[PDB]
Design a protein around this ligand. Structure first.
Ligand SMILES: CC(=O)N[C@@H]1[C@@H](O)[C@H](O)[C@@H](CO)O[C@H]1O
Ligand SMILES: CC(=O)N[C@@H]1[C@@H](O)[C@H](O)[C@@H](CO)O[C@H]1O
Ligand SMILES: [Ca+2]
Ligand SMILES: [Ca+2]
Ligand SMILES: [Ca+2]
Ligand SMILES: [Ca+2]
Lengths: 111, 111
């Protein structure tokens, strides 16, 4: 598994399109080791390939597989405002759910 | 080095933008092993990061570094018509110079 980060920010739909263009997907850490590797390639807050768009509070990857390993920041996920169904990896390595329409860097994963 | 192929076709400038978006560059094979590795991922004719834009018949990689290894198809490079200053890897692994404005798949290189 190889991780590459974008230089520009974009919403999740554009992020998915970017990783998909090179036949990869938005990065989804499956353990602490991958979480750190992703954090390291990302120089700022970046999107992960995890959402609870299908079912609220049920987080799964972009292929529908419910995630097992999580690393939520204290107080997250909180689905605040009108809702937050996407996930970003903070600069300290913890996760926060955010609106999928907001823009962040993207880390793509390839195998 | 890791090589990934795009799914859509695009001109060289767009190909460069795609690869650089994930901090990589358009694939430039430095030997037959890498040439074969690029073949493995390119399901159809694809752009390589080489051009003779500066001086006709002097091929350099995208950073203006003159290349050493080449694998031209018989009869190539022929700079047909108004000129062909970009390079693509054919499905047999041999190269052909083509117009930089024409669209082809792109293979990106990372390391
Ligand atoms: C759009 C955005 O950044 N919203 C975040 C929210 O997701 C997070 O739960 C909260 C924690 O205090 O901080 C807000 O700023
Ligand atoms: C746009 C294009 O594909 N032009 C190619 C040209 O680059 C190549 O040298 C020649 C060899 O016969 O075949 C042409 O079709
Ligand atoms: Ca939610
Ligand atoms: Ca939140
Ligand atoms: Ca030429
Ligand atoms: Ca030619």
């Amino acid at each position: 598994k190889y991780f590459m980060s974008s230089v520009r920010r974009m919403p999740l739909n554009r992020a998915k399109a970017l990783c998909s263009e090179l036949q990869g997907t938005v990065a989804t850490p499956r353990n602490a080791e991958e979480n750190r590797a992703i954090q390291n390639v990302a120089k700022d807050v970046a999107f992960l390939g995890i959402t609870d768009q299908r079912t609220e509070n049920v987080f799964e990857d972009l292929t529908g597989n419910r995630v097992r390993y999580t690393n939520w920041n204290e107080g997250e996920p909180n689905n605040v405002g009108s809702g937050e169904n996407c996930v970003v990896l903070l600069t300290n390595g913890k996760w926060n759910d955010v609106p999928c329409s907001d823009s962040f860097l993207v880390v793509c994963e390839f195998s």
